[PDB]
Symmetry: none
Subunit: 79 residues, 6 copies
């Protein structure tokens, strides 16, 4: 039987990193977010082998990890 | 040891559907793009069980399919 | 005339899935619910085109399947 | 001089515990929240003895500490 | 693989609290039992993560100490 | 003074992944090469913060690993 190949890209969102920053200006229990931050990214490129319309196997071609944007939490205390 | 859990969202682009239409008013051999396709996507959210910094298992939580638009080609 | 658009989500409850487990400590003919379980749902997001106060067309934007929580039945015999 | 007995359930939120970790690769003076943290709870069951409408005494039947979750923070280090 | 959870309960007897009163001016050297004293019990509730039919990790959900009674002893 | 940033690309060869497949068939202390290895390629993009013309520090912005080819040997 013959075969064919096709590439697939799968994106996994990385956990948002949250920075806790201290600001002496804020009261004791007062805190706000400086920025919401965007999730980082883990992109994998795969290659599938197709035999009779079925993926018979797959190889991982590459894996790229891109840092995201931090979520910044600003509070009036230093932990 | 102890364990924690976390959410994991994974996106997969779906193969674009391509319809082929025909037009006699058009010379055979000619092909026009009546509609550029748009790839839909499959978004999966999983729940990973983390032990000692390592994911030891995962359960599917939800599976979403964002539709997308068919590619349409007219051939004389 | 002019038009407006609006999104609406439709939720269809999914049949609860029930798992049957064997408990050697249970007497024959005796069983109990270990987990009532919850129904999964199929959520579809649609977009409507409204003309003069009446839906004139709709597109299916998304189709999601949210897994439910299994109903767990434990009994003192093995089916 | 006859008596009756009564039970009471008392609850109070426990303070979230916070662990501090260090990472050499992280910039000194920068902190990242690893785990939010959730408050535990202490549930106490007491028993009172009532004589002539007043509580003459009370015993502690049980004490349950419903475990919460630690707050985990990582700090950059040299 | 997928995972599942399960809750375990575990009872453990606690040491018996000791108490020592002191008199009626009893011949210093002798002693009488004032109270039998029973052990208190700690009840721990755990939740195990199961993967491929094996507990891979466990967390403590709660800890209950059911108070006992002291063994009171009167010494002269 | 003020500061600016610049990004730098760095590529590295990854240590070849060694795979050993045993076979009770073939004799003692004998080994055959099933597949030659090929190193994976790691491409990291860094961001340098520059003050007064000099790099004071640098952060990692993205890391790509282009999988290689395992070297497979039959032992046993």
């Amino acid at each position: 039987s013959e075969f064919t190949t096709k590439e697939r890209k799968v994106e996994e969102a990385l956990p948002i990193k949250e920075e806790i920053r201290y600001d002496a200006s804020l009261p004791l229990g007062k805190s706000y977010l400086l920025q919401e931050g965007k999730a980082g990214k883990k992109v994998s490129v795969y290659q599938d082998v197709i035999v009779d319309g079925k993926v018979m196997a797959t190889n991982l071609l590459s894996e790229t990890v891109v840092e995201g944007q931090n979520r910044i939490l600003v509070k009036g205390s230093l932990e």
